[PDB]
Amino acid sequence: QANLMRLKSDLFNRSPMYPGPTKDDPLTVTLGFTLQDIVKVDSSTNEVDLVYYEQQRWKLNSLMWDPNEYGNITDFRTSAADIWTPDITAYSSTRPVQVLSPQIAVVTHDGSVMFIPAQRLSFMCDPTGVDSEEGVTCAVKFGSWVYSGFEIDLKTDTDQVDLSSYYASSKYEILSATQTRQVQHYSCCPEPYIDVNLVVKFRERR
Amino acid sequence: QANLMRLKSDLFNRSPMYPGPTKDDPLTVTLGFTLQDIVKVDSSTNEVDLVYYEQQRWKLNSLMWDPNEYGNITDFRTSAADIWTPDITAYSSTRPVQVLSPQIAVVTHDGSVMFIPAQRLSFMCDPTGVDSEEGVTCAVKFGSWVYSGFEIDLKTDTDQVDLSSYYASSKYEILSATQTRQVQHYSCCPEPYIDVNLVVKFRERRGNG
Amino acid sequence: QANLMRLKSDLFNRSPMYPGPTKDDPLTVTLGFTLQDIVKVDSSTNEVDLVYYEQQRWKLNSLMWDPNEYGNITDFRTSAADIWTPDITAYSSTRPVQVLSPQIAVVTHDGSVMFIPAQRLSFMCDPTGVDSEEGVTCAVKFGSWVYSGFEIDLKTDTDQVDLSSYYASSKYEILSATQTRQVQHYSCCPEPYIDVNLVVKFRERR
Amino acid sequence: QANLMRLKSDLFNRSPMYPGPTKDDPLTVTLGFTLQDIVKVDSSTNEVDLVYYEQQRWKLNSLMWDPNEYGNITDFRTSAADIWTPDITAYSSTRPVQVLSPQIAVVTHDGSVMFIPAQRLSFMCDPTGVDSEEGVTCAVKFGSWVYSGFEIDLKTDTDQVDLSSYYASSKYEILSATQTRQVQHYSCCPEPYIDVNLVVKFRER
Amino acid sequence: QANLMRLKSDLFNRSPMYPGPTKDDPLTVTLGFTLQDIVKVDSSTNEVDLVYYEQQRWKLNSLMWDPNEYGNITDFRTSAADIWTPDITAYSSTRPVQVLSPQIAVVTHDGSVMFIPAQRLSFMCDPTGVDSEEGVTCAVKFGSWVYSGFEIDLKTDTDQVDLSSYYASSKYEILSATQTRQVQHYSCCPEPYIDVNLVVKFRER
Ligand SMILES: NC(=O)c1ccc(-c2cc([C@H]3C[C@@H]4CC[C@H]3N4)cnc2F)cc1
Ligand SMILES: NC(=O)c1ccc(-c2cc([C@H]3C[C@@H]4CC[C@H]3N4)cnc2F)cc1
Ligand SMILES: NC(=O)c1ccc(-c2cc([C@H]3C[C@@H]4CC[C@H]3N4)cnc2F)cc1
Ligand SMILES: NC(=O)c1ccc(-c2cc([C@H]3C[C@@H]4CC[C@H]3N4)cnc2F)cc1
Numbered sequence A, C: 001q002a003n004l005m006r007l008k009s010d011l012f013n014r015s016p017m018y019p020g021p022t023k024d025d026p027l028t029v030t031l032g033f034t035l036q037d038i039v040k041v042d043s044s045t046n047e048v049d050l051v052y053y054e055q056q057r058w059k060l061n062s063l064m065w066d067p068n069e070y071g072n073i074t075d076f077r078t079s080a081a082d083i084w085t086p087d088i089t090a091y092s093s094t095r096p097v098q099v100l101s102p103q104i105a106v107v108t109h110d111g112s113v114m115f116i117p118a119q120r121l122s123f124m125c126d127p128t129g130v131d132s133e134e135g136v137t138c139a140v141k142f143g144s145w146v147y148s149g150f151e152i153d154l155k156t157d158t159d160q161v162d163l164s165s166y167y168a169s170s171k172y173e174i175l176s177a178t179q180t181r182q183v184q185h186y187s188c189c190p191e192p193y194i195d196v197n198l199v200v201k202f203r204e205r206r
Numbered sequence B: 001q002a003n004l005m006r007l008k009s010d011l012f013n014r015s016p017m018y019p020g021p022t023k024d025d026p027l028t029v030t031l032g033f034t035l036q037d038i039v040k041v042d043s044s045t046n047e048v049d050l051v052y053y054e055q056q057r058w059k060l061n062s063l064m065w066d067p068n069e070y071g072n073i074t075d076f077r078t079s080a081a082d083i084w085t086p087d088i089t090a091y092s093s094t095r096p097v098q099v100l101s102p103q104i105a106v107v108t109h110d111g112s113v114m115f116i117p118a119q120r121l122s123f124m125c126d127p128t129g130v131d132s133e134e135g136v137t138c139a140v141k142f143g144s145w146v147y148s149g150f151e152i153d154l155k156t157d158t159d160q161v162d163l164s165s166y167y168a169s170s171k172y173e174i175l176s177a178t179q180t181r182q183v184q185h186y187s188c189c190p191e192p193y194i195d196v197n198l199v200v201k202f203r204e205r206r207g208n209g
Numbered sequence D, E: 001q002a003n004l005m006r007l008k009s010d011l012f013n014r015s016p017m018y019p020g021p022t023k024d025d026p027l028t029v030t031l032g033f034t035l036q037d038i039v040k041v042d043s044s045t046n047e048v049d050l051v052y053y054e055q056q057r058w059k060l061n062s063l064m065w066d067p068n069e070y071g072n073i074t075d076f077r078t079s080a081a082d083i084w085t086p087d088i089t090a091y092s093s094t095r096p097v098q099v100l101s102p103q104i105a106v107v108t109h110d111g112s113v114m115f116i117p118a119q120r121l122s123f124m125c126d127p128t129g130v131d132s133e134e135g136v137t138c139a140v141k142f143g144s145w146v147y148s149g150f151e152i153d154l155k156t157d158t159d160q161v162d163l164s165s166y167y168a169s170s171k172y173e174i175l176s177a178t179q180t181r182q183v184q185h186y187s188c189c190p191e192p193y194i195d196v197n198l199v200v201k202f203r204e205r
């Protein structure tokens, strides 16, 4: 309708696109995971496949509007191609991430943005011992590929992974799943990089 | 020809694209399934592969026209890129959906749209006992990913899935299948979300009953 | 060369694209198949894989020209993305069709268009018995996905599938292969739909 | 830098794109193969997988220039999307060809173009006997899909396939590899079609 | 924000895009590898699968700017499609390379560009004997596909591959990993081509 069409036009067609965060105007991205299934374990390559969805949240000044000038609209759905999105990357993936959900985000009038992509990820993980009582632990770090802590900081609202949608007839049951902010120093690069460490302990269901 | 070119120019070139539904102007989408084949079952990963086509139907005021002004055209075929389509998503898929049919919809002069994508889906299903007489039951929810019940509502014209085109020499025979509207509350989000729940009961092709 | 550049400019840049057939201006598409190979049979999923090319031919008034006004040019090759092409679809496929030839068509001065895509198709077929003398029969319907018989009719020039290019060292030999126009109704839709039914009888090579 | 930006602007941004060859102005494409590996043999489906690169060469008047008018530039690299390229197709492929090299060509001042795509190809081949001393022979034709011999002719500079880059630890050794022009008639079509027939004899190492 | 939007507009919207290096304006690209995992070995096809990231660095005058004129910005992140990038190719790949990281580079005020793509590569490698204590050695050359040594030269900062992110529970342990500039003369082409040779010696853990 007319009001939403005006708002989208005023936000996206007038200005050039947001060029991303800088040292003077840094950005904090909130991350959270909802784990749906450990689909597959490969003991001959030490790869494990997860299905999850990842809640991403950030805020920009350039996406603010006054609701009363646009028919009391407080939020709207928009294609993720119309906006900047953070370059969050699994640091130990072995295949390109597969997208399982529409590339659509929600923008709120205060400038906040929320994007919740469902994904299937293959990553490095040794499953030896998964058929035992103690189970096995594996971890994967999620963070910006190209932005140091001076441009992108991360945090979580909770260190507990949401397990309320976990597939009840999975081959594997979860013993614990946590999501924790940490600071990393890489050999390539003298600046600190932030990531959220997803740590999942699991075993064969029996 | 001339009259259709004129109609498509007037609908798509003059105005900006429809920005999707809102709370003030919500939308109801009708869904229905025609199940063609259960292609395979993976008992080591609890994945099942379905081939089906999915009838989607909705109505917009912005796609209305008077047929008298356009050579009595009452409908037309158009690329699904030319129009908004609902973001209907399987909630327990394990692979991206594969598209098996041309991305083309039919628009009618009252503003109603019909779009019938044929798809192959891998989703989460435990096939233990599929080789029994009783068979196994599995389910997958289809609904909007991003829109709550305040912007998108769903319904079916019937709760009976169409099985009249099911592949007769499939490895799996279908005993029954239903498609039912339901309301969901996810822990991420306070608003109700609407889905259609596809339930399929099946077993390895034998037989008895 | 100057004449062809003029012709293509006059046909494609002076007008909007052809919007496809209608009830008032319907179209007949001629189909024929040339079967190259039955590559693979999967008896665990009842899928079979063919390689073939599919001659498509139709005629539009909007693609006519006088050869004497364009240096006696009687036909030309053009990208299939520059023209409308029919949405011919296999009705029992189990995977997206794979394209094995360049997406180029030939337009003739009478307005006729010929497009001959080579394809690999996986489709529903029970191969049980293929290792016997009687072999096995399988079938797949090809037709428009969205256009009824009132907008697109189909026909064939012959009911015999061309086997003159069939791979002589294939695992499978062809006993017969036919292509036949059919009409039927679907529950979705009030009008009849036209298809061409590809019926192939084959057995393991002896 | 400035002289190359001028030359490219003058060749591509002025005139419309080359519309391909015609009966009045036909084109000869030179083909040659460099075989890197026979990677895979599937005896259950009679498919074989090659990795190779394929030298394609042709010449157009609309790509000519005088070096002296452009800072002594005698050739340049450009995206293969910026130009027309020939629709050379394997006639017995069973999968889409996989592209293993960047889509960049080299244009020279006489109007000649050279494009050398690296490719992995699955094609129809019965490998029964590959484990013997005699080995097995397999063949695949490369030619235009849509142009007859009246618009596109083919040739080779040599009948021998270049084997100097063949992988020394491949499962298969090459006994011979030739590339030969031939004329073909298909039942679809009354005109002759030209192809280069790649014939490779090989056995297990 | 305002200053970065001005700078990007001034670098990418004012001028035509860089047309790549020439003989009069050659370019040197620095390469370095960080090996993360030997994921897979296929002893029936002699293919091996590596996961790594590859640091690429080069420098262009046309990407230079004065920080004082742009709010003291010394560098910025930009999409790799907005800039020219070198066509670095693995010369013995058997499949298209898979991209595992965002296609974003960092440009610095002196005109230097750094791009560090994460990749998965299948390449030709005989793994027979990987289950022994001696292990096996494999090599793959990385260089420009279309530019000779007269337009693109390569170098490394160090001969030693970075193994500090190597997956500790990999099926395979690394015995050595080096990256070495070499000069190649191919039978197709009479000019020298530069590559960096990645040599990895490994065995089952
Ligand atoms: N300040 C700079 O000039 C700069 C900063 C960062 C990079 C950069 C770093 C990286 C690495 C940091 C972490 C660890 C591996 C990968 N992600 C990737 N891509 C990049 F472009 C390049 C140049
Ligand atoms: N009111 C808001 O600001 C809002 C509303 C909806 C979302 C949103 C929700 C979702 C979730 C709802 C259901 C359950 C999981 C996924 N599908 C996905 N993507 C989204 F953008 C984000 C923000
Ligand atoms: N008259 C209309 O409003 C109309 C007509 C046709 C369609 C339509 C039909 C179909 C079905 C007909 C055949 C059988 C399955 C699929 N192909 C697919 N896609 C479509 F858009 C939709 C609406
Ligand atoms: N003269 C014409 O009107 C004409 C000429 C050629 C074609 C054509 C031929 C072909 C076949 C010839 C060879 C054998 C299989 C495939 N390549 C493919 N695609 C085409 F468009 C169509 C129409």
Ligand SMILES: NC(=O)c1ccc(-c2cc([C@H]3C[C@@H]4CC[C@H]3N4)cnc2F)cc1
Pocket (backbone or CB within 6 Å): D053, D075, D104, D105, D106, D108, D114, D115, D116, E144, E145, E146, E186, E188, E189, E193
């Ligand atoms: N000067 C020229 O006319 C020229 C120069 C280079 C090429 C060229 C070379 C190559 C080869 C060099 C290395 C060895 C195999 C492949 N990569 C690939 N693609 C190309 F376009 C073509 C023409």
Ligand SMILES: *[C@@H]1O[C@H](CO)[C@@H](O)[C@H](O)[C@H]1NC(C)=O
Pocket (backbone or CB within 6 Å): A071, A072
């Ligand atoms: C928006 O809010 C105002 C203030 O409460 C109200 O009067 C008005 O009816 C609302 N709706 C529109 C469409 O303006």
Ligand SMILES: *[C@@H]1O[C@H](CO)[C@@H](O)[C@H](O)[C@H]1NC(C)=O
Pocket (backbone or CB within 6 Å): D070, D071, D072
């Ligand atoms: C081109 O080559 C000539 C002859 O060697 C040389 O004298 C001249 O300086 C060159 N011109 C340019 C513009 O580089």
Ligand SMILES: O=C([O-])C(=O)[O-]
Pocket (backbone or CB within 6 Å): C026, C027, C028, C149, C150, C151, C152, C153
């Ligand atoms: O004539 C036709 O082609 C028709 O009516 O479909």
